[PDB]
Design a protein around this nucleic acid. Structure first.
Lengths: 302, 177, 247, 302
DNA sequence: GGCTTTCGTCAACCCTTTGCTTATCTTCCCT
């Protein structure tokens, strides 16, 4: 009687950001874009470490990739292209029964709120991760379908109602609940100040030889699409004891805090989609969490 | 015990071979024992349905014990008995199947022969053991039977890490010159 | 007096890289000798030898494992199991840009020879791989030995196959002298008594185990004698070079 | 009476496509072909497997081959050729009794619909699964016998009537129903956008180093030839409860979705093949299905 | 009397992480 999930049931991602190239502009000269180059500086400090206090007096030489604004331009510009694709319910590897019953159990999902939180995370500048601190104003210009949309002051921890994010999110929800696609050409102008140090994505490297190795595209400082995609889907205010929005994982798990906000207490995604497939009526934000997982994608089987 | 094992093998399908198309296709089941290539260090393969057979006190099937210390050549030359030679040879048969196997034409002089290439078992087992022993890492590794290789072949059942085959890639020509 | 037709840059993809049980990679000289006798059958131009070189060749997969092919449920009687994934028998695939040079003897103009080879190659299949592209074949003749080297250097750039022979066996010398092993032919084991499940019922059939020789890759210009790169069907149910063992 | 099938009856592949080399061009300069290079990135995420709530908290590091457009070209170009080969009834392993009576029951196959669906799968962009979505405008340029056609907007899930694909299908059906060969050089111009991630073939390979390993050809992103061959034969809209075209399989089996649409309901290739041989009046659509299987080829064990 | 479907049967690893080669070039001479 229990409809088990397919062993290879997987969903493709539906929010596809590009790698976010960072340029340097002014708050006035936004047409003068010079690429933020990744430089490499050798930096000496103290050994630190929680243990081993005997070698505290010894130095610490580490070679670190840095990325800074030049001392003639005070604004960091971040360019990326977010592609919201539709058909979020057609599993590319699990189409059949389970997948399709999840679709019919998720037809009345509030796609407007999911699209609103996605477009707000793009619009409030959450895709800027550590660049936002020290920025005097973060101006987001989202060009949808040749549609300039300017945002100036949006607080990030809560999704306050405005008309421009909702205006973009109307057709973003029309794409997500239906078919087709929409492309958001996103530019972030941040008055970080003269010569402020910007924070790109850092590569994962195991061969070492360099302590911090920033993500670069032909040398220009850039951000990983995955970081932007994590920040776009940071919409999950529906876990147990929800204080801040977290990214949408199947387990509600962020790995910096070393916790899982939705595992071990029967609101991880697999339990909810098993309930929704097996005719257990989810609540509204429950369906929004499951549909946000399907928009994020992943594989849910075995 | 060894006679116990040879007879355990014979109650079952009971095939001992040096060449087979079973490695090419697991659905094939053609097993061929060539007599001329049996030497001192000739590794020898055997087939049972689903690789069945009892183990000894040290936890080995017949494939381990027949393949160390040149034991198959010892039974083959009859240092352990001529009635054992018979038991061994009762399992050493040539079973033939050409379905799910490649069939090519080779020129034999004013005519062609349809050759069905089946793989040498001694080449697979001894090559895997030697090229892992002699540190030859210009190779590919392939698990032959699939997820559970006991339906294929006793050597695929036991050597689950995959057989070593030669990486036969040629050197490339650099386009920018 | 020798005549050759060269097809340069034969981009072929989907090559059955499984040369044998213990060799996966470049197709052996039995494959290209089979391609040569295939045109001897379709086009009628009877081919003595073929010298083949590899411009490019990549086996699909990692550096230690080949990419297996997702099998399709094509056997009869296993419906019901067709919804699950088909079991994978090992057949590595590869891509390769080759340069082929066929020894032919021809008595007509070079244009109809080029057209016949082009019409064969448009319907040919190098090692089970679809011929993606190929340059227009060109005819060159080896009147003398300097002219033989002209034909040799007309295959530039390619890495041709030269035979270096078997000293003791295949594994030993592949580690020791570091040469590559490939199928130079086959060894007949048993006569086949059942011709019902075969391509022809009248052609005599044998189960075979592939014999191998040890070979090296040398660029065609660095090969001193072009006869050491031209493989042909020897009368030992094997293939062999005209120049013998490369020294 | 009751002419049985051969045990190892086999047919050769008649639609032979080449590997789809991926290049980067602009919609303006579509002659600026630039090999999209398969890059290798390393990915930090959260491990979220059906049975992993205990390990959800910890991270998950995967090295993955990616392939993205460069940020100066907004168009993905796809290169392949498709060679349609005649003699679709000449079995190379099956005997001359079952295969010839199979053939003589199949001259009444309307090859025009088969060729129309083959060239429409070529032209609509069916060979471009995950990168035809998110494309602003697709454009297929088919060159055959020094004559060139262009297709802008063809919906891929149904075969609507247009004179250009039918005009190519005239010579494709002439080759398939007759002799010889024909070759269509296909140029896919897909306006994905600036730096949009492209989707080459992933490989079925045991790779300890790379969790996801893409298909490259000299590093250049490429797609598998049998992948495009699966795309071209995705014409089967004639199975039981037919909604979407599936690939022409002997059992109508998509193992990707875990469902075989022609297995068990007496509409697979073997039952219709025996009905065609043994004089049972085969329907037109089953006739075209058996002919499409013979065009695809395969060995048939039984 | 086969014949075709589905369920039961039988297993168990020690792995290694780039080169293979390495490109087709001017002396005499007289017109």
């Amino acid at each position: 009687t229990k409809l088990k999930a397919p062993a290879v049931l997987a969903y493709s991602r539906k929010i596809n950001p590009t790698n976010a190239l960072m340029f340097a502009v002014n708050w006035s000269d936004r047409d003068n874009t010079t690429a933020v180059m990744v430089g490499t500086k050798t930096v000496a400090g103290t050994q630190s470490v929680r243990g081993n206090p005997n070698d505290a007096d010894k130095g610490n030489i580490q070679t670190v990739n840095f990325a800074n604004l030049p001392h003639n331009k005070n604004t960091l510009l971040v360019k990326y292209n977010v592609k919201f694709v539709g058909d979020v319910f057609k599993a590319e590897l699990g189409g059949g029964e389970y997948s399709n019953t999840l679709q019919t159990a998720l037809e009345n999902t509030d796609f407007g709120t999911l699209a609103y939180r996605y477009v707000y995370n793009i619009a409030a500048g959450r895709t800027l991760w550590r660049n936002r601190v020290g920025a005097e104003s973060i101006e987001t210009v989202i060009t949808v379908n040749d549609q300039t949309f300017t945002f100036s002051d949006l607080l990030v921890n809560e999704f306050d109602e405005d008309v421009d994010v909702a205006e973009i999110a109307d057709m973003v929800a029309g794409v997500l609940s239906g078919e087709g696609f929409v492309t958001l050409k996103v530019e972030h102008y941040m008055l970080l100040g003269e010569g402020s140090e910007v924070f790109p994505s850092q590569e994962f490297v195991e061969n070492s030889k360099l302590s911090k190795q920033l993500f670069d595209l032909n040398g220009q400082a850039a951000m990983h699409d995955q970081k932007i995609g994590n920040a776009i889907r940071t919409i999950d205010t529906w876990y147990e004891d929800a204080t801040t929005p977290i990214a949408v994982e199947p387990y509600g798990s962020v790995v910096r805090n070393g916790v899982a906000y939705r595992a071990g207490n029967k609101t991880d995604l697999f339990t909810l989609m098993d309930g929704a497939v097996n005719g257990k009526s989810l609540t509204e934000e429950d369906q929004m969490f499951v549909t946000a997982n399907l928009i994020r994608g992943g594989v849910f089987g075995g | 015990m060894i006679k116990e094992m040879i007879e355990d093998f014979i109650s079952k399908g009971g095939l001992i071979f040096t060449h087979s198309g079973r490695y090419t296709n697991t659905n094939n089941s053609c097993f061929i024992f060539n007599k001329n290539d049996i030497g001192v260090d000739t590794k020898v393969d055997m087939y049972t349905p689903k690789s069945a057979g009892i183990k000894n006190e040290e936890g080995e099937n017949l494939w381990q014990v027949l393949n160390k210390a040149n034991m198959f050549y010892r039974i083959y030359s009859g240092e352990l008995g001529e009635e054992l030679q018979y038991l061994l040879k009762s399992c050493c048969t040539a079973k033939e199947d050409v379905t799910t196997l490649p069939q090519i034409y080779f020129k034999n002089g004013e005519g062609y022969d349809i050759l069905v290439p089946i793989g040498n078992a001694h080449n697979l087992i001894s090559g895997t053991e030697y090229l892992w022993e002699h540190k030859y890492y210009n190779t590919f590794t392939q698990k032959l039977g699939g997820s559970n290789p006991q339906n294929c072949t006793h050597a695929c059942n036991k050597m689950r890490g995959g057989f070593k085959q030669f990486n036969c890639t040629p050197p490339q020509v650099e386009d920018n010159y | 007096m020798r005549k050759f037709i060269i097809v340069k840059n034969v981009k072929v993809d989907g090559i059955n890289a499984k040369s044998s049980d213990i060799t996966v990679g470049m197709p052996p000289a039995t494959t290209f000798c089979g391609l040569g006798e295939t045109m001897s059958i379709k086009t009628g131009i009877v081919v003595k030898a073929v010298s083949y070189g590899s411009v490019k060749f990549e086996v699909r997969g990692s550096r230690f494992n080949t990419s297996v092919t997702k099998f399709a449920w094509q056997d009869r009687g296993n419906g019901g199991k067709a919804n699950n994934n088909s079991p994978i028998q090992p057949k590595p695939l590869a891509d390769g840009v080759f340069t082929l040079c066929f020894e032919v003897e021809w008595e007509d103009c070079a244009e109809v020879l080029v057209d016949k080879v082009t019409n064969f190659i448009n319907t040919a299949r190098i090692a089970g791989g679809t011929i993606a592209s190929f340059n227009k074949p060109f005819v060159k003749v080896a009147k003398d030995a300097e002219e033989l080297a002209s034909v040799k250097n007309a295959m530039m750039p390619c890495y041709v196959v030269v035979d270096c022979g078997v000293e003791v066996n295949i594994f030993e010398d592949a580690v020791n002298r570091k040469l590559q092993p490939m199928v130079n032919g086959y060894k007949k084991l048993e006569k086949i008594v059942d011709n019902k499940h075969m391509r022809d019922k009248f052609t005599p059939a044998y189960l075979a185990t592939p014999t191998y020789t040890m070979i090296g890759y040398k660029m065609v210009s660095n090969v001193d004698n072009f006869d050491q790169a031209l493989w042909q069907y020897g009368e030992n149910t094997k293939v062999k070079t005209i120049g013998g063992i490369y020294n």
